[PDB]
Design a binder for this molecule. Structure first.
Ligand code: 5U6
Ligand code: CL
Ligand code: CL
Ligand code: CL
Ligand code: MG
Ligand code: ZN
Ligand code: ZN
Length: 108
């Protein structure tokens, strides 16, 4: 029995992962795939961690999920140089994901 907020966050997640066809952001980045990663990135984030937070009722709002999504993409721009495939992928995903997540206030 999931809450309406959990349901809403799951639906946003399905849309966001469709914008990552290479699966670069599905799971945590290890020091084996990315030498020295843990030496540089001190606040890691990825889509599997976000899904576990949803399941554990660790989100209070869509805002919180959007900020963790931003943190995941910004981390790739700190660790990887601008010329690399991972920096370019992060920029593309940040922009398409924010088109999904951003919206106008809704007033009564
Ligand atoms: C090339 O394959 C992968 C690359 C990355 C990867 C991601 N990001 C965000 C990086 O910053 C990054 C930086 N340097 C090296 C690698 C990566 C990955 O991370 C979980 C998983 C795979 C496995 N693949 C079958 C999907
Ligand atoms: Cl992987
Ligand atoms: Cl950007
Ligand atoms: Cl940009
Ligand atoms: Mg708020
Ligand atoms: Zn915020
Ligand atoms: Zn940008």
């Amino acid at each position: 029995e999931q809450t309406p907020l959990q349901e809403a966050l799951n639906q946003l997640m399905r849309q966001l992962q469709r914008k990552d066809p290479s699966a670069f952001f599905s799971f945590p980045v290890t020091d084996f795939i990315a030498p020295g990663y843990s030496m540089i990135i001190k606040h890691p984030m990825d889509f599997s961690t976000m899904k576990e937070k949803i399941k554990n009722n660790d989100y209070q709002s869509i805002e919180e999920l959007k900020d963790n999504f931003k943190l995941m993409c910004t981390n790739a721009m700190i660790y990887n140089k601008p010329e690399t495939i991972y920096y370019k992928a992060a920029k593309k995903l940040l922009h398409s994901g924010m088109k999904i997540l951003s919206q106008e206030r809704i007033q009564s």
